[PDB]
Amino acid sequence: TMEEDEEVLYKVRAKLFRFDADAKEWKERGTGDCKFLKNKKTNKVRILMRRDKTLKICANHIIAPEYTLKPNVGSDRSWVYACTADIAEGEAEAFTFAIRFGSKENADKFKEEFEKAQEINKK
């Protein structure tokens, strides 16, 4: 499973989108628990998200300190950001992600946690 050398920092239900710049539209990528996992050895935190029933990975990347969360025009409960190395679907790809939550409260809490975890990887 390759999650035993890791500790869970944050868990929240969410829906993940990837931006198809060609078609200029958001495409769903997965619904499930979004987790912040801090490797106990190297202390770097990653985002790991699995789809609900099949448990396949839809997000797998370090919460790099260079990332910035921006709002999406149509939602007060979502965040948009760019990701240069995500290995959910195999080889490391680049993606513009959007993640939506059940409430603005969960979305603000995620941004708090997302930024706390950035301070961890900046060492």
């Binding site: 499973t1 390759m2 999650e3 239900r13 969410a14 829906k15 993940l16 989108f17 931006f19 710049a21 200029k24 539209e25 958001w26 495409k27 769903e28 990528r29 997965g30 619904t31 490797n39 770097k44 990653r46 790991l48 699995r50 789809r51 609900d52 029933k53 099949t54 448990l55 396949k56 990975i57 839809c58 797998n60 990347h61 370090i62 790099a64 260079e66 921006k70 709002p71 999406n72 025009v73 149509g74 939602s75 979502s78 948009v80 760019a82 240069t84 190395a85 995500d86 290995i87 490391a92 513009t96 959007a98 939506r100 939550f101 059940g102 990887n121």
Partner: protein
């Protein structure tokens, strides 16, 4: 360990959307009729190792049928799709089954009633009985709400492997690389990003 799966049913029943949901996780709202067949590989992780389904998503529209029953040759399992909001698609289930078992005489077959997420349901659960005499497994599914969307493949994997205790397991999570952004294009990580930022997310009225 790969198995050929043919996917048949009337046009518009949701065959292509159901497969796309399993390949990428997306929900396609447009109806672009499949032309002949589209083969996609689809791998599931089980407690008995990975299993790969070579999914032959055929065309339901007669004018786009392609080779028709020629797609069924050497298939090892099958899914028959119909639309619970369309009585016609269920009256054609015996026809798709007829063409299928004349070529595939002894394979596991799932009967799926799609679009159970729509309030105005036309094919009531009480009238869906065709699978009984034909030894098909039946599932109410929805590629939109993901209701029972994993059970067609879970049942087939249990019949193809021969292990009724087979379960889906979490695929391992390899360590993700540490990479810095590209300042050669980081001045342009603001065009295709502000575009995505101003393209509204779909279905904002959902729970997620």
């Amino acid at each position: 360990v790969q198995f050929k799966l043919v996917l048949v049913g009337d046009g518009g029943t949701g065959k292509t959307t159901f497969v796309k949901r399993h390949l990428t996780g997306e929900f396609e709202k447009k109806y672009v009729a499949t032309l002949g067949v589209e083969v996609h590989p689809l791998v599931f992780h089980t407690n008995r190792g990975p299993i790969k389904f070579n999914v032959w998503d055929t065309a339901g529209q007669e004018k786009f049928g392609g080779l028709r029953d020629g797609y069924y040759i050497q298939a090892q399992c099958a899914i028959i799709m119909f639309d619970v909001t369309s009585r016609v698609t269920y009256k054609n289930v015996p026809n798709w089954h007829r063409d299928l078992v004349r070529v595939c005489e002894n394979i596991p077959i799932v009967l799926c009633g799609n679009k159970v997420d729509i309030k105005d349901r036309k094919v009531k659960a009480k009238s869906i009985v065709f699978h009984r005499k034909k030894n098909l497994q039946y599932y109410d599914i929805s590629a939109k709400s993901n209701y029972n969307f994993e059970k067609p493949f879970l049942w087939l994997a249990r019949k193809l492997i021969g292990d009724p205790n087979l379960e889906f397991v979490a695929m391992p999570a390899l360590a993700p690389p540490e990479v810095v952004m590209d300042p050669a294009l980081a001045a342009q990580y603001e065009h295709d990003l502000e575009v995505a930022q101003t393209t509204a997310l779909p279905d904002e009225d959902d729970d997620l």
